[PDB]
């Protein structure tokens, strides 16, 4: 891991023994903001909207 890739608030993982960073890990997202990301697209389509 290069020091340039660890941007502030990156949620790194530290080894238990010596606490060395060995991964970057996905950035932390508040649990409740994650549910607001549409992972399953809704079924409505443009042809269903009329007028």
């Amino acid at each position: 891991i290069d020091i340039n890739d660890v941007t502030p608030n990156c949620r790194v993982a530290l080894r238990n023994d010596s606490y060395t960073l060995h991964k970057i890990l996905p950035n932390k997202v508040d649990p409740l903001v994650s549910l607001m990301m549409v992972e399953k697209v809704p079924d409505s389509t443009y042809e269903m909207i009329g007028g």
């Binding site: 993982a13 991964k23 890990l25 649990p31 994650s34 549910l35």
Partner: protein
């Protein structure tokens, strides 16, 4: 040897496991588990587990010593 390895994998799950909350899966063969002890950990997921069951936040039993999700 394969039978012994299967028995070893089954013995990884050996009862006294700490219950934890699955926070988010970094990638297959690993994930972040929030142990009920009060510390967030980065652990290694077991292959035999069902990936579908890994909801966004579900109760996952973790190995007491290695803390790997089992």
């Amino acid at each position: 040897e394969f039978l012994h390895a299967q028995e070893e994998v089954k013995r990884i799950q050996s009862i006294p496991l700490v219950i934890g909350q699955f926070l988010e899966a970094v990638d297959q063969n690993t994930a972040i588990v929030g142990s009920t002890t009060g510390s967030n950990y980065y652990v290694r997921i077991l292959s035999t587990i069902d990936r579908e069951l890994l909801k966004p936040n579900a109760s996952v039993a973790l190995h007491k010593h290695s803390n790997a999700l089992v």
